[PDB]
Design a protein around this ligand. Structure first.
Ligand SMILES: Cc1cn([C@H]2C[C@H](O)[C@@H](COP(=O)(O)OP(=O)(O)O)O2)c(=O)[nH]c1=O
Ligand SMILES: Cc1cn([C@H]2C[C@H](O)[C@@H](COP(=O)(O)OP(=O)(O)O)O2)c(=O)[nH]c1=O
Ligand SMILES: Cc1cn([C@H]2C[C@H](O)[C@@H](COP(=O)(O)OP(=O)(O)O)O2)c(=O)[nH]c1=O
Ligand SMILES: Cc1cn([C@H]2C[C@H](O)[C@@H](COP(=O)(O)OP(=O)(O)O)O2)c(=O)[nH]c1=O
Lengths: 193, 187
């Protein structure tokens, strides 16, 4: 019972390079149809670069946390993130050296209920906390996977100080559990504007 | 990370991605330009769509856009299952009016490449089926054309013919012999 006239709403977050996208849901007797991406519209609202790789993660239990992740330059991925089933608390962290918002973060709830999408530009790290069982997270990347370039910052880093709605149990990968603290992170991304 | 398999109409390509399981669940790379372009799948993906079909027996198709708005489509099912159909509607094609089908599901995570020049149809086999597809051209409603699912010249073997939920546009699809088609065979 939430109505939007236009096919996409684009909303800049407090870190304005991060963009929350609300697509339009067309309901009928069959079910629904959503346009989830449209280059022409996205490019007019600041979202640039060729999407070279799409990924899909299933997280079976509430409390799965993945992040914080980025690829070193020149393999930095811009990401368009959505949840087709379930719900996540989704986080973008500005890790662009010299950025007036370096080490700051914004969050949004991405779910199969809202069908919201988050644009996380290159220069940022991504983290997500699973809030519903069997959560399917899909994202498009502006650069292809380069495992050697992947870096890992721990979820509970105190300088970043993300307010995770951690309810009870936390399921972490070994790489994420072994995430480093921001102060000893390897970062080459540079702020431009 | 991907197996690519040409169908009997060899421009139609079945893609089997690799599933990495762990304690958290799984990870799949569902598209990768470098790999896809090496295996014949070309064109910029300009638009992504998502359809939910609540009941078994929802049928959508048969759909294409006239040139110059023809969409190549990369089709997958993230939840549920469809009987997915590609129909060759390229004038002068040795397989004009022929079709290939595959089962796309959340169990197999298979994907189908349906090149421009083809029509797409899908029949929903599990409740709450989520079909996702990437298009090589943006939506142009004026260019959309609709061919009846049960057209007798195309003669698709749909695994269900009865409890069928159709859109009004699909119900009103035209028969192949009176279809508007401008796509041309080059291959
Ligand atoms: C709420 C919020 C905090 N933050 C950062 C700013 C601060 O470093 C920290 C806020 O938590 P806290 O240290 O408790 O607040 P304060 O610094 O105002 O005493 O987290 C964000 O980057 N984004 C947000 O949305
Ligand atoms: C991020 C990523 C991972 N993988 C593989 C490597 C591992 O086997 C598995 C999980 O990787 P992992 O780095 O744990 O993913 P997450 O970002 O969710 O923590 O997926 C790819 O094949 N491609 C990708 O782009
Ligand atoms: C089985 C199959 C049939 N077809 C075509 C061939 C026929 O024109 C029609 C099915 O008819 P069919 O009963 O297979 O052959 P016939 O009628 O010649 O005895 O659909 C395809 O295009 N793809 C397929 O995978
Ligand atoms: C195919 C398509 C449909 N729509 C809208 C128009 C209708 O309100 C709704 C369903 O269109 P419809 O043509 O019935 O979809 P399907 O191909 O599944 O039969 O979605 C778009 O906004 N973009 C698209 O690319």
């Amino acid at each position: 019972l939430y109505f939007q006239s236009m096919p996409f709403e684009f909303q800049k977050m407090l870190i304005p390079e991060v963009i929350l996208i609300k697509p339009k849901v067309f309901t009928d007797d069959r079910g629904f149809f959503i346009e989830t991406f449209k280059q022409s519209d996205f490019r007019r609202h600041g979202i640039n670069g060729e999407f070279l790789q799409d990924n899909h993660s299933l997280s079976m239990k509430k409390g799965v946390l993945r992040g914080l992740h980025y690829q070193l330059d020149p393999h930095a991925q811009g990401k368009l993130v959505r949840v087709v089933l379930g719900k996540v608390f989704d986080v973008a962290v500005d890790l662009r050296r010299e950025s007036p918002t370096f080490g700051k973060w914004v969050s949004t709830e991405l779910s199969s209920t809202n069908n919201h999408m988050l644009w996380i530009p290159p220069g940022f790290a991504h983290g997500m906390l699973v809030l519903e069982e069997n959560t399917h997270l899909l994202y498009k990347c502006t650069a292809e996977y380069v495992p050697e370039s992947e870096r890992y910052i721990r979820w509970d880093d105190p300088d970043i100080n993300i307010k995770w709605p951690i309810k009870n149990n936390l399921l972490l990968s070994e790489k994420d559990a072994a995430g480093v603290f921001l102060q000893r992170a390897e970062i080459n991304a540079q702020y431009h504007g």
